[PDB]
Coordinates of C-alpha atoms in Angstrom, one line a residue:
Chain A
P728 CA -6.6 4.0 12.1
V729 CA -6.3 2.4 9.0
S730 CA -6.0 4.7 6.5
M731 CA -5.8 8.5 5.9
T732 CA -7.4 10.8 3.0
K733 CA -4.9 10.1 -0.1
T734 CA -4.8 13.9 -0.9
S735 CA -3.0 15.5 -3.0
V736 CA -1.8 19.0 -4.7
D737 CA -0.9 20.6 -7.9
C738 CA 2.1 22.3 -7.0
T739 CA 2.4 24.8 -9.8
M740 CA -1.0 26.1 -9.3
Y741 CA -1.1 26.1 -5.8
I742 CA 2.5 28.6 -6.4
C743 CA 1.6 30.4 -9.4
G744 CA -1.9 30.3 -9.8
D745 CA -2.9 31.7 -13.6
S746 CA 0.1 33.6 -14.6
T747 CA 3.1 32.3 -16.5
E748 CA 5.3 35.1 -15.2
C749 CA 5.4 33.5 -11.8
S750 CA 5.3 30.0 -12.9
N751 CA 8.9 31.3 -15.3
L752 CA 9.9 32.3 -11.8
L753 CA 9.5 28.5 -10.4
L754 CA 11.0 27.2 -13.0
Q755 CA 14.2 28.5 -11.3
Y756 CA 13.7 26.1 -8.4
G757 CA 14.4 22.9 -9.8
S758 CA 12.3 20.4 -9.0
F759 CA 10.7 20.7 -5.8
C760 CA 7.3 20.2 -7.8
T761 CA 8.8 16.8 -9.4
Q762 CA 9.7 15.6 -5.8
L763 CA 6.4 17.1 -3.8
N764 CA 4.3 15.3 -6.4
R765 CA 6.1 12.4 -5.7
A766 CA 6.5 12.4 -2.3
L767 CA 2.7 13.1 -2.0
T768 CA 2.1 10.1 -4.4
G769 CA 4.1 8.1 -2.8
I770 CA 1.7 8.9 0.4
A771 CA -1.6 7.7 -1.6
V772 CA -0.1 4.4 -3.1
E773 CA 0.6 2.8 0.6
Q774 CA -2.4 4.4 1.7
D775 CA -4.2 1.5 -0.2
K776 CA -1.1 -1.3 0.4
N777 CA -2.5 -0.7 4.4
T778 CA -5.7 -1.2 3.8
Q779 CA -5.0 -3.9 0.5
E780 CA -2.9 -5.8 3.9
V781 CA -5.4 -5.3 6.8
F782 CA -8.8 -6.5 5.5
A783 CA -7.9 -8.8 2.1
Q784 CA -6.3 -11.3 3.9
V785 CA -8.8 -14.2 3.4
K786 CA -8.9 -15.3 -0.9
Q787 CA -12.5 -16.9 -0.7
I788 CA -15.2 -13.7 0.3
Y789 CA -17.3 -17.0 2.3
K790 CA -20.6 -16.6 3.5
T791 CA -23.2 -17.8 6.4
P792 CA -25.8 -20.3 5.6
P793 CA -29.3 -18.3 6.0
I794 CA -29.8 -20.9 9.3
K795 CA -28.5 -18.7 12.6
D796 CA -28.5 -21.7 14.9
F797 CA -25.7 -20.8 16.4
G798 CA -25.7 -22.6 20.0
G799 CA -28.0 -20.1 21.2
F800 CA -25.5 -16.8 19.8
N801 CA -27.6 -14.7 18.3
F802 CA -25.4 -12.4 16.1
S803 CA -27.6 -10.8 13.8
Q804 CA -26.3 -7.3 15.3
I805 CA -22.9 -8.4 13.7
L806 CA -23.0 -10.5 10.4
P807 CA -24.6 -8.0 7.5
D808 CA -28.4 -6.7 6.7
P809 CA -29.8 -7.7 3.6
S810 CA -33.4 -5.4 3.8
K811 CA -30.9 -2.4 4.6
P812 CA -29.7 -0.6 1.3
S813 CA -26.4 -0.9 1.9
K814 CA -24.3 -4.4 2.4
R815 CA -23.1 -3.2 5.8
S816 CA -24.5 -4.8 9.4
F817 CA -26.0 -3.3 12.2
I818 CA -23.1 -1.9 14.5
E819 CA -21.2 -0.8 11.6
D820 CA -23.9 1.3 11.0
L821 CA -23.3 3.2 14.3
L822 CA -19.7 3.9 13.6
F823 CA -21.2 5.6 10.4
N824 CA -22.9 7.9 11.6
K825 CA -20.9 8.1 15.0
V826 CA -17.6 9.7 12.7
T827 CA -18.2 13.5 10.6
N856 CA -8.5 25.4 -4.8
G857 CA -5.7 23.4 -6.6
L858 CA -6.2 20.3 -3.7
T859 CA -7.5 17.3 -5.3
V860 CA -8.6 14.3 -2.7
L861 CA -8.3 11.1 -5.2
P862 CA -11.2 8.4 -3.7
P863 CA -9.9 5.3 -1.7
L864 CA -9.2 2.0 -3.7
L865 CA -11.6 0.4 -2.0
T866 CA -15.1 1.4 -1.4
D867 CA -17.3 0.8 1.8
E868 CA -19.2 -1.6 0.2
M869 CA -16.6 -3.5 -0.9
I870 CA -14.6 -2.9 2.7
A871 CA -18.0 -4.4 3.9
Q872 CA -17.7 -7.6 2.4
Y873 CA -14.6 -8.8 3.6
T874 CA -15.7 -8.2 6.5
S875 CA -18.6 -10.1 6.2
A876 CA -15.9 -13.1 4.8
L877 CA -14.2 -12.9 7.9
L878 CA -17.1 -12.7 10.2
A879 CA -18.4 -15.4 8.6
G880 CA -14.5 -18.2 8.4
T881 CA -15.0 -17.1 11.8
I882 CA -18.5 -17.8 12.4
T883 CA -18.4 -21.4 10.9
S884 CA -15.0 -22.5 10.0
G885 CA -13.5 -22.5 13.5
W886 CA -9.8 -20.9 12.8
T887 CA -9.6 -23.4 10.1
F888 CA -9.8 -20.8 6.9
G889 CA -7.2 -19.3 8.0
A890 CA -5.0 -21.7 7.4
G891 CA -6.3 -23.6 4.5
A892 CA -9.3 -24.6 2.6
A893 CA -12.4 -23.4 5.3
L894 CA -13.8 -26.7 7.6
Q895 CA -17.6 -26.5 8.6
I896 CA -17.7 -27.5 12.5
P897 CA -20.3 -26.8 14.7
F898 CA -19.9 -23.6 16.6
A899 CA -20.9 -24.8 19.7
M900 CA -17.4 -27.4 18.8
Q901 CA -15.6 -24.0 18.3
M902 CA -15.9 -22.5 21.5
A903 CA -15.1 -26.1 23.3
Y904 CA -12.1 -25.9 20.8
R905 CA -11.3 -22.4 22.4
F906 CA -11.8 -23.4 25.9
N907 CA -8.6 -25.7 25.5
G908 CA -6.7 -23.2 24.1
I909 CA -7.1 -21.2 27.9
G910 CA -6.4 -24.4 30.1
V911 CA -10.2 -25.5 30.4
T912 CA -11.5 -28.8 29.6
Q913 CA -14.3 -29.1 27.1
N914 CA -16.9 -30.0 29.9
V915 CA -17.4 -26.7 31.5
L916 CA -18.5 -25.3 28.6
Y917 CA -21.7 -27.9 27.4
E918 CA -22.2 -28.2 30.9
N919 CA -22.7 -24.5 30.5
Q920 CA -23.4 -23.3 27.6
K921 CA -27.0 -22.0 28.0
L922 CA -25.6 -20.1 30.6
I923 CA -22.7 -18.5 28.1
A924 CA -24.5 -17.7 25.6
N925 CA -27.1 -15.5 27.4
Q926 CA -23.8 -14.0 28.8
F927 CA -22.3 -13.9 25.4
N928 CA -25.7 -12.3 23.7
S929 CA -26.1 -10.0 26.4
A930 CA -22.3 -8.9 26.1
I931 CA -23.3 -7.6 22.5
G932 CA -26.1 -5.7 23.3
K933 CA -24.0 -3.6 25.8
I934 CA -21.7 -2.6 22.5
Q935 CA -24.6 -1.2 20.8
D936 CA -25.5 1.1 23.9
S937 CA -22.1 1.6 25.2
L938 CA -21.0 3.1 21.3
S939 CA -24.8 4.5 20.9
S940 CA -24.7 7.0 23.9
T941 CA -20.9 7.2 24.4
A942 CA -20.8 9.1 21.4
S943 CA -16.3 10.4 21.4
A944 CA -15.8 6.7 22.2
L945 CA -14.2 6.7 18.8
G946 CA -12.1 9.8 19.5
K947 CA -9.0 8.0 17.4
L948 CA -10.3 7.1 13.9
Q949 CA -11.9 11.1 14.4
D950 CA -9.3 12.4 15.4
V951 CA -6.9 11.6 12.5
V952 CA -10.0 12.7 9.9
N953 CA -9.9 15.8 12.0
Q954 CA -5.9 16.0 12.0
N955 CA -5.8 16.6 8.2
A956 CA -8.4 18.8 6.9
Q957 CA -6.2 20.5 10.3
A958 CA -3.1 21.1 8.2
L959 CA -5.3 21.7 4.6
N960 CA -6.8 24.6 5.9
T961 CA -3.9 26.1 7.7
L962 CA -2.4 24.9 4.2
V963 CA -5.0 27.0 2.5
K964 CA -4.6 29.7 5.3
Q965 CA -1.8 30.7 4.4
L966 CA -2.3 31.9 0.7
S967 CA -3.2 34.9 2.8
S968 CA -0.4 36.0 4.1
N969 CA 2.3 38.2 2.1
Chain B
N641 CA -16.1 4.8 -26.1
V642 CA -15.9 6.6 -22.9
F643 CA -16.4 5.6 -19.1
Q644 CA -17.1 7.4 -16.5
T645 CA -16.2 6.3 -12.4
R646 CA -16.8 8.0 -9.4
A647 CA -13.1 8.6 -10.0
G648 CA -13.1 10.7 -13.0
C649 CA -13.8 10.1 -16.5
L650 CA -11.7 7.4 -18.5
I651 CA -11.2 7.9 -22.1
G652 CA -10.1 4.6 -24.8
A653 CA -11.6 1.7 -22.1
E654 CA -14.4 -0.4 -22.4
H655 CA -16.6 -1.2 -19.8
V656 CA -17.0 -4.8 -19.0
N657 CA -20.3 -6.0 -16.9
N658 CA -17.5 -9.2 -15.7
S659 CA -15.5 -9.4 -13.1
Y660 CA -11.3 -10.0 -12.5
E661 CA -8.5 -9.5 -9.8
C662 CA -6.9 -5.8 -9.8
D663 CA -4.5 -5.3 -13.1
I664 CA -4.5 -1.4 -12.7
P665 CA -6.1 0.2 -9.6
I666 CA -8.7 3.1 -11.1
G667 CA -10.9 4.0 -7.8
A668 CA -13.6 3.6 -5.7
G669 CA -12.9 -0.7 -7.5
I670 CA -12.9 0.4 -10.4
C671 CA -9.8 -1.4 -12.3
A672 CA -8.2 -2.2 -15.5
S673 CA -6.2 -4.0 -17.6
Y674 CA -5.4 -5.0 -21.4
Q675 CA -6.9 -8.6 -22.5
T676 CA -8.7 -9.6 -25.3
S689 CA -8.3 -8.8 -31.1
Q690 CA -7.3 -7.4 -27.9
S691 CA -8.1 -3.5 -26.0
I692 CA -8.0 -2.0 -22.3
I693 CA -11.0 -2.9 -20.3
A694 CA -11.7 -1.5 -17.2
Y695 CA -14.1 -3.0 -15.1
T696 CA -15.6 -3.8 -11.1
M697 CA -12.9 -5.4 -8.7
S698 CA -13.5 -8.6 -8.2
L699 CA -13.1 -10.2 -4.8
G700 CA -12.3 -13.8 -5.3
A701 CA -15.1 -15.9 -6.2
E702 CA -17.6 -15.9 -3.3
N703 CA -17.7 -19.6 -1.5
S704 CA -20.9 -21.1 1.0
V705 CA -19.7 -23.3 3.7
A706 CA -22.3 -26.3 4.3
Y707 CA -22.5 -25.5 8.0
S708 CA -24.9 -27.2 9.7
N709 CA -25.3 -28.2 13.5
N710 CA -23.7 -31.6 13.1
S711 CA -21.4 -31.9 10.8
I712 CA -17.9 -31.3 10.4
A713 CA -15.0 -31.5 7.7
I714 CA -11.6 -32.8 8.4
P715 CA -8.6 -32.9 6.3
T716 CA -7.2 -36.3 5.3
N717 CA -4.1 -36.1 3.4
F718 CA -2.2 -32.4 3.3
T719 CA 1.0 -30.3 2.1
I720 CA 3.9 -29.0 2.2
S721 CA 4.3 -26.1 0.7
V722 CA 7.2 -23.6 1.3
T723 CA 6.5 -19.8 0.5
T724 CA 9.3 -16.6 0.4
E725 CA 9.1 -13.4 2.1
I726 CA 11.2 -10.9 1.7
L727 CA 12.5 -7.9 3.8
Chain C
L922 CA 6.0 -38.8 0.8
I923 CA 7.0 -35.1 3.3
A924 CA 10.6 -35.7 1.7
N925 CA 9.3 -35.5 -1.9
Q926 CA 7.3 -32.6 -1.3
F927 CA 9.6 -30.6 0.5
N928 CA 12.2 -31.3 -1.6
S929 CA 9.7 -30.3 -5.2
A930 CA 8.7 -27.6 -2.8
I931 CA 12.4 -26.6 -3.0
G932 CA 12.4 -26.7 -6.7
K933 CA 9.9 -24.6 -7.4
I934 CA 11.4 -21.5 -5.7
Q935 CA 14.2 -21.3 -8.2
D936 CA 11.6 -21.1 -11.3
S937 CA 9.5 -18.8 -9.1
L938 CA 12.7 -16.8 -8.8
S939 CA 14.4 -17.6 -12.1
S940 CA 11.7 -16.0 -14.2
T941 CA 9.7 -13.1 -12.9
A942 CA 11.4 -10.2 -11.2
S943 CA 8.2 -8.9 -9.3
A944 CA 9.5 -11.2 -6.8
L945 CA 12.1 -8.7 -5.4
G946 CA 10.2 -5.5 -6.0
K947 CA 10.8 -4.8 -2.6
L948 CA 14.5 -4.5 -2.3
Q949 CA 14.3 -3.2 -5.8
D950 CA 12.4 -0.5 -4.6
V951 CA 14.6 1.1 -2.1
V952 CA 17.1 0.9 -4.1
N953 CA 15.5 2.8 -6.8
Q954 CA 14.1 5.5 -4.1
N955 CA 17.8 6.6 -3.2
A956 CA 18.8 6.6 -6.8
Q957 CA 15.8 9.4 -7.4
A958 CA 17.0 11.2 -3.7
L959 CA 21.1 11.4 -5.2
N960 CA 19.9 12.1 -8.3
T961 CA 17.4 14.8 -7.5
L962 CA 20.3 16.4 -5.1
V963 CA 22.9 16.1 -7.6
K964 CA 20.3 17.7 -10.2
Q965 CA 19.5 20.4 -8.2
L966 CA 23.3 21.7 -8.5
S967 CA 22.3 23.3 -11.6
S968 CA 19.4 25.2 -10.6
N969 CA 20.0 29.1 -10.6
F970 CA 17.9 30.0 -7.5
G971 CA 17.7 33.6 -9.2
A972 CA 21.2 34.1 -9.2
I973 CA 23.0 35.3 -12.4
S974 CA 24.4 32.0 -13.0
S975 CA 24.9 28.5 -11.6
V976 CA 28.9 27.7 -11.5
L977 CA 29.9 28.9 -8.3
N978 CA 33.7 29.1 -10.0
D979 CA 32.2 31.0 -12.7
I980 CA 30.2 33.8 -10.8
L981 CA 33.2 34.5 -8.9
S982 CA 35.6 34.7 -12.3
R983 CA 33.4 37.4 -13.6
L984 CA 32.2 39.3 -10.3
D985 CA 34.4 41.4 -7.9
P986 CA 33.3 40.4 -4.0
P987 CA 30.8 43.2 -2.9
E988 CA 28.5 42.4 -5.4
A989 CA 28.9 38.9 -5.7
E990 CA 27.7 38.0 -2.3
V991 CA 24.5 39.6 -3.1
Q992 CA 24.7 36.9 -6.0
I993 CA 26.5 33.7 -3.9
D994 CA 24.0 33.9 -1.1
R995 CA 21.2 33.4 -3.2
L996 CA 22.6 30.6 -4.5
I997 CA 24.1 29.3 -0.5
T998 CA 19.9 29.7 0.5
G999 CA 19.4 27.8 -3.0
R1000 CA 21.3 24.8 -2.1
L1001 CA 21.3 24.4 2.1
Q1002 CA 17.4 24.4 1.6
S1003 CA 18.1 21.3 -0.8
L1004 CA 20.3 19.4 1.4
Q1005 CA 17.5 19.4 4.9
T1006 CA 14.4 18.1 2.4
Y1007 CA 17.1 15.5 0.9
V1008 CA 18.5 14.7 4.6
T1009 CA 14.7 15.5 5.5
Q1010 CA 13.7 12.6 3.3
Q1011 CA 16.6 10.1 4.9
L1012 CA 16.1 10.4 7.8
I1013 CA 11.8 9.6 7.5
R1014 CA 12.6 7.0 4.8
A1015 CA 15.3 6.0 7.8
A1016 CA 13.0 5.4 10.0
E1017 CA 10.9 3.1 8.4
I1018 CA 13.6 0.7 6.7
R1019 CA 14.0 0.3 10.0
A1020 CA 10.8 -0.7 11.6
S1021 CA 11.3 -3.5 8.7
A1022 CA 14.5 -4.7 10.2
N1023 CA 13.0 -5.5 13.8
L1024 CA 10.4 -6.0 12.4
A1025 CA 13.1 -8.7 10.3
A1026 CA 15.2 -9.9 13.6
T1027 CA 12.0 -11.2 15.3
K1028 CA 10.8 -12.7 12.0
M1029 CA 14.3 -14.3 12.5
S1030 CA 14.1 -15.2 16.0
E1031 CA 10.8 -16.2 16.6
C1032 CA 10.5 -18.0 12.9
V1033 CA 14.0 -19.6 12.4
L1034 CA 15.4 -20.6 15.6
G1035 CA 12.2 -21.5 17.0
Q1036 CA 8.0 -22.6 16.1
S1037 CA 5.7 -19.8 16.1
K1038 CA 2.0 -19.9 16.3
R1039 CA 0.8 -16.8 15.8
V1040 CA -1.3 -17.7 12.4
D1041 CA 0.3 -16.1 9.1
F1042 CA 3.2 -14.6 10.9
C1043 CA 5.5 -17.4 9.4
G1044 CA 3.6 -17.6 5.8
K1045 CA 0.0 -19.3 5.3
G1046 CA -0.9 -22.3 7.1
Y1047 CA 0.6 -23.9 10.0
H1048 CA 3.8 -23.2 10.6
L1049 CA 6.8 -25.6 10.7
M1050 CA 10.0 -23.6 10.4
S1051 CA 12.2 -21.3 8.2
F1052 CA 15.5 -21.1 6.9
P1053 CA 16.9 -17.4 5.9
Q1054 CA 19.1 -16.5 3.0
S1055 CA 21.0 -13.5 2.5
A1056 CA 20.2 -10.9 -0.2
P1057 CA 21.6 -8.0 -1.3
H1058 CA 20.6 -4.7 1.4
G1059 CA 18.0 -7.1 2.7
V1060 CA 17.1 -10.6 4.4
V1061 CA 15.1 -13.5 2.3
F1062 CA 13.1 -16.2 4.2
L1063 CA 11.7 -19.3 3.5
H1064 CA 8.7 -20.1 5.6
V1065 CA 7.8 -23.9 5.7
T1066 CA 4.3 -24.4 6.4
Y1067 CA 2.3 -27.2 7.1
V1068 CA -0.7 -27.4 5.2
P1069 CA -4.4 -29.8 5.8
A1070 CA -5.4 -30.9 1.6
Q1071 CA -7.9 -33.1 1.5
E1072 CA -11.1 -33.0 3.5
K1073 CA -14.5 -35.0 3.8
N1074 CA -17.7 -34.5 5.3
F1075 CA -18.3 -36.1 8.8
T1076 CA -21.7 -36.4 11.4
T1077 CA -19.9 -35.5 14.2
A1078 CA -21.4 -35.6 17.7
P1079 CA -20.3 -33.1 20.9
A1080 CA -20.1 -36.0 23.5
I1081 CA -21.8 -39.2 23.5
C1082 CA -23.0 -40.8 26.7
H1083 CA -22.7 -44.7 27.5
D1084 CA -24.0 -45.4 31.3
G1085 CA -25.7 -42.6 31.8
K1086 CA -22.0 -40.9 32.3
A1087 CA -21.3 -38.3 29.3
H1088 CA -17.9 -39.3 27.8
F1089 CA -16.3 -36.7 26.2
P1090 CA -12.7 -36.3 24.0
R1091 CA -8.9 -36.1 24.7
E1092 CA -7.4 -34.7 22.5
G1093 CA -9.4 -35.0 18.9
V1094 CA -13.2 -34.8 17.9
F1095 CA -16.1 -37.4 17.6
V1096 CA -16.8 -38.2 13.9
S1097 CA -18.8 -41.2 12.1
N1098 CA -19.0 -43.0 8.8
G1099 CA -22.4 -43.3 9.6
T1100 CA -22.2 -46.7 10.8
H1101 CA -19.8 -46.1 13.4
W1102 CA -18.4 -44.0 15.8
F1103 CA -15.1 -43.1 16.3
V1104 CA -12.7 -40.3 17.8
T1105 CA -10.1 -38.5 15.6
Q1106 CA -7.8 -35.9 16.1
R1107 CA -8.8 -33.1 14.9
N1108 CA -6.1 -31.9 11.8
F1109 CA -5.5 -35.5 10.4
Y1110 CA -8.1 -38.5 9.9
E1111 CA -7.6 -41.1 11.7
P1112 CA -10.4 -43.1 13.5
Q1113 CA -9.6 -45.1 16.7
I1114 CA -11.8 -46.9 18.6
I1115 CA -13.8 -44.9 21.0
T1116 CA -12.1 -45.9 24.5
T1117 CA -11.9 -45.2 28.1
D1118 CA -8.1 -44.3 27.1
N1119 CA -9.8 -41.2 24.5
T1120 CA -11.9 -40.4 27.3
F1121 CA -13.0 -38.8 30.4
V1122 CA -16.1 -39.2 32.2
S1123 CA -18.0 -35.7 33.3
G1124 CA -21.7 -35.4 34.3
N1125 CA -24.6 -37.8 32.3
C1126 CA -26.1 -37.7 29.5
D1127 CA -29.1 -35.4 30.0
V1128 CA -27.3 -31.5 30.3
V1129 CA -24.8 -32.0 27.5
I1130 CA -26.7 -30.5 24.3
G1131 CA -26.8 -32.7 21.2
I1132 CA -24.8 -36.0 23.0
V1133 CA -25.9 -39.3 21.1
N1134 CA -26.2 -42.7 22.4
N1135 CA -23.1 -45.2 22.3
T1136 CA -21.6 -47.7 23.9
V1137 CA -17.4 -46.7 24.9
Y1138 CA -14.8 -49.5 24.6
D1139 CA -13.6 -50.6 27.9
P1140 CA -9.9 -52.5 27.8
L1141 CA -9.7 -54.2 30.9
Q1142 CA -12.9 -56.0 30.6
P1143 CA -11.3 -58.7 28.4
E1144 CA -8.2 -58.5 30.0
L1145 CA -10.9 -59.5 33.3
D1146 CA -12.8 -61.5 31.0
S1147 CA -9.8 -64.5 30.6
Chain D
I1018 CA -0.4 5.0 10.4
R1019 CA 1.4 2.6 8.4
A1020 CA 2.5 1.8 11.7
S1021 CA -1.2 1.0 13.3
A1022 CA -1.4 -0.5 10.3
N1023 CA 0.8 -3.2 10.4
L1024 CA -0.2 -3.6 14.4
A1025 CA -3.9 -3.4 13.2
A1026 CA -2.9 -6.0 10.4
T1027 CA -0.9 -8.3 13.0
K1028 CA -4.2 -8.5 15.3
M1029 CA -6.4 -8.9 12.8
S1030 CA -4.3 -12.0 11.6
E1031 CA -3.0 -13.3 14.8
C1032 CA -6.4 -12.2 16.8
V1033 CA -8.9 -12.7 14.6
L1034 CA -7.8 -15.5 12.3
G1035 CA -6.5 -18.0 15.1
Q1036 CA -6.4 -17.6 18.6
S1037 CA -3.2 -15.9 20.3
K1038 CA -2.2 -16.8 24.2
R1039 CA -0.2 -12.7 24.1
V1040 CA -1.5 -12.2 27.2
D1041 CA -3.1 -8.5 27.4
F1042 CA -2.4 -8.5 23.2
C1043 CA -6.5 -9.2 22.6
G1044 CA -8.1 -7.5 24.8
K1045 CA -8.1 -8.0 29.0
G1046 CA -8.3 -11.5 29.3
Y1047 CA -7.6 -14.7 28.2
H1048 CA -8.7 -14.4 24.4
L1049 CA -11.2 -16.5 23.3
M1050 CA -11.9 -15.1 19.3
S1051 CA -12.1 -11.9 17.7
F1052 CA -14.5 -10.3 15.8
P1053 CA -13.9 -7.2 13.2
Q1054 CA -16.1 -4.6 11.6
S1055 CA -15.8 -2.1 9.3
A1056 CA -14.6 1.7 10.2
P1057 CA -14.2 5.1 8.3
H1058 CA -10.3 5.0 7.3
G1059 CA -10.3 2.6 10.4
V1060 CA -11.2 -1.2 11.6
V1061 CA -13.2 -2.3 14.8
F1062 CA -12.3 -5.4 16.6
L1063 CA -15.1 -7.2 18.9
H1064 CA -12.6 -8.9 21.7
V1065 CA -14.5 -11.3 23.1
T1066 CA -12.7 -12.0 26.3

């Protein structure tokens, strides 16, 4: 989970909705409106320093070249879809489908339209520029090599990769494929995020339902 | 003189076709700033220059000179 | 050259701190919050909470006890609520600071007394070392990071073979300036003649994808030739 | 949430932008690389191990 819903509440109209006589009395209690409206607003801004920090970590929005000859690896599942109206990727679309006064709800600073761009960027830097682009200027490097690098990272000599390239590709390409089906059937695989939204609506309903008690 | 957002109504600022970094956030990716004779402009958030890497199955790019840097970080 | 960059690097910090105030937002923030927390707590004392006054000594001076308890109880339940709100706020904020503290300590341990490889755990770029500094209610680090700067296109190849046997690099990659072929280390161009000290045999040409025909130098043969 | 946010932030930095050796910090096994994917209010990684 990354961010809640930037909720906020008008204290005054929630307590003493449209009555000066009521609103007169609340004036006795000092600044409880002042804190809460400050308190919640304190939450709201944080709900964007959150998202700003997880995603906005690459300076330049990269983008893959048109070709897709990555040593045999088929990334068509996770790269964005130009045909699809929304600028998202295939697996992302499953995730969207898998998750379902006096109380305003401020919309998040970033949109799913933009958020997809960063996750397009990072997925472009890693796919092409190895891990360098995090450190500095992105450097292209043939994707087969990048594995060969990353094998040395786990104490396995380069030779096993190249001598097993095509075999790995199918293992890798197949591995992605199970993700679609794994997420497709198992709807409940996203219990975490779904819980967050459920918890917040849980409170709000409780918050509203309190009015009907004397 | 009046702009409309997926986040609300804005009054007294000019929508601009351009794009810039977010000086003051509004919502849904619209950010407002004071700029050129001058006034307040509001616009779609920009996310840095679009960049493309010249990938190719047989092409690599290697640094040849390096920069030290010193960056603050406060806790 | 590195010396001047490092010396130059430090100098810009002084300017980066002398002029702009926004750098110390975080420390200057938490101080501000507590001020409001205190002020809001202090300001509450003037609220009447429904009693006929706000001064506890006044309400006594004007009434004999038996109905004062009707008045004073209204204050007590008022202010008493006002504290525990303030306390709970402080408690909540207390946890956040410690979360920052433990992060700081670790960010001191792993980043000062050592050298981490956890990217972007010690500033952007590869991490070299780091110096701490005191600060009111906080600490300020100075990450010193290496960053590659000037880059060049090159035509590479994952592997080369010379006698049927394929040769791979030991440390670094294979690049070609277009005419010659060189092995060089992977973060600073430094072409070395491709030789059996840099490589190690495995398999043969026709299995690896994208291998290129070339010749690997041998140190021993000229020595044997003499 | 912010605890999860930072935990996410660290993972996106360490586990994606680079390659970590903190065992069992990037999916069971030796870690190779990891791609992120967006999600409502949240992030999903694909640890390739």
